[PDB]
């Protein structure tokens, strides 16, 4: 995250860190014990891929980290990288063994299609990650986070001219200076509500980092709720 | 009283009763406080909460 700020020990305790070729490439967020939902780009194929929870620093220990193996991926099923790089940008990993909750292990709440988008509207959500804190110099040691506003939709397409699509929107500042970025894809969007965070978006992709007149384009967690719910049940 | 204003009150969930009424709800991990307007823990961990104390 470019423009960030440091998390405290427990302040995002939904995000995890993913390792695969190298550590922290991406993040994610948990939906349950045996559930995370990322972006599915991070998703090379041949890649073990290890998440590990209650992580604030990348390279200390807290003693409140949980490292879990991914057994099943499920890349949402409209995502196909060769004819959009970035749409349907969601996927799912299944845990091995259920993580063990606690309050820096803690899901992140989804609502419904409808709720969901209307916490989005609210026009501000926290993003988070490790990824890169400057536009191209070094990953993250602290968890970043930013408070990032909607975009508005047309201003949004007189952005880029690259291809938004339905199933993506738009957060940051007009003026550049403070953005996610590359390390911090398939991190959460969440939206605050009275205390309760929401996941409202996955961080997806953007036209470089904290420029001016560039915003970061999220996956529309609401168009992909009923899936989620679906997919990673509990029994 | 209806869900078009403030959500009914309901901090969460809002939903138009059929008796000219709101009835409110919550999300998993949640129960609905005996305000019937907020939303209390039901689980230890419940979803979306920061319960390290900052
Ligand atoms: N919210 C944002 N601004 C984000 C940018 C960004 C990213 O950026 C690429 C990058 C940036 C800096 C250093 C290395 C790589 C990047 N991607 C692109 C790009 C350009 C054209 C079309 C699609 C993507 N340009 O930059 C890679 C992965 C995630 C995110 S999120
Ligand atoms: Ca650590």
Same mark, same amino acid.
């Given at each position: 995250?470019?423009?960030? &700020? ?12 993913? /390792? ?24 090379? +194929? ?12 990348? &390279?200390? +220990? ?17 995502? /196909?990288?060769?004819? /959009? ?20 292990? +803690? ?122 719910? &679906? ?5 | ?54």
């Amino acid at each position: 995250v470019v423009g960030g &700020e440091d998390a405290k020990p427990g302040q995002f305790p939904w995000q995890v860190v993913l /390792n695969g070729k190298v550590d922290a490439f991406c993040g994610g967020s948990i939906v349950n014990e045996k559930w995370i939902v990322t972006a599915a780009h991070c998703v090379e +194929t041949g890649v073990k891929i290890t998440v590990v929870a209650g992580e604030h620093n990348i &390279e200390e +220990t807290e003693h409140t980290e949980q490292k879990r193996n991914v057994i099943r991926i499920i890349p949402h099923h409209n995502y /196909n990288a060769a004819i /959009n790089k970035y749409n349907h940008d969601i996927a799912l990993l299944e845990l091995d063994e259920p993580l063990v909750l606690n309050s820096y292990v +803690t899901p992140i709440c989804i609502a419904d299609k409808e709720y969901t988008n209307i916490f989005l509207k609210f026009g501000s959500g926290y993003v988070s990650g490790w990824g890169r804190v400057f536009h191209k110099g070094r990953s993250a040691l602290v968890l970043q986070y930013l408070r990032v506003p909607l975009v508005d939709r047309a201003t949004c397409l007189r952005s880029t001219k690259f291809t938004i699509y339905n199933n993506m929107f738009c957060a940051g500042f007009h003026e550049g200076g403070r953005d996610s970025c590359q390390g911090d894809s398939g991190g959460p969007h969440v939206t605050e509500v009275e205390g309760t965070s929401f996941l409202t978006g996955i961080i997806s992709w953007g036209e470089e980092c904290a420029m001016k007149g560039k915003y970061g384009i999220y996956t529309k967690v609401s168009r992909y709720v009923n899936w989620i719910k &679906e997919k990673t049940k509990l029994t | 009283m209806t869900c078009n204003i403030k959500n009914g009150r309901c901090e969460q969930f809002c939903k138009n009763s059929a008796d000219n009424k709101v009835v409110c709800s919550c999300t998993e991990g949640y129960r609905l406080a005996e305000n019937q307007k907020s939303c209390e823990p039901a689980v230890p961990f419940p979803c979306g909460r920061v319960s390290v104390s900052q």
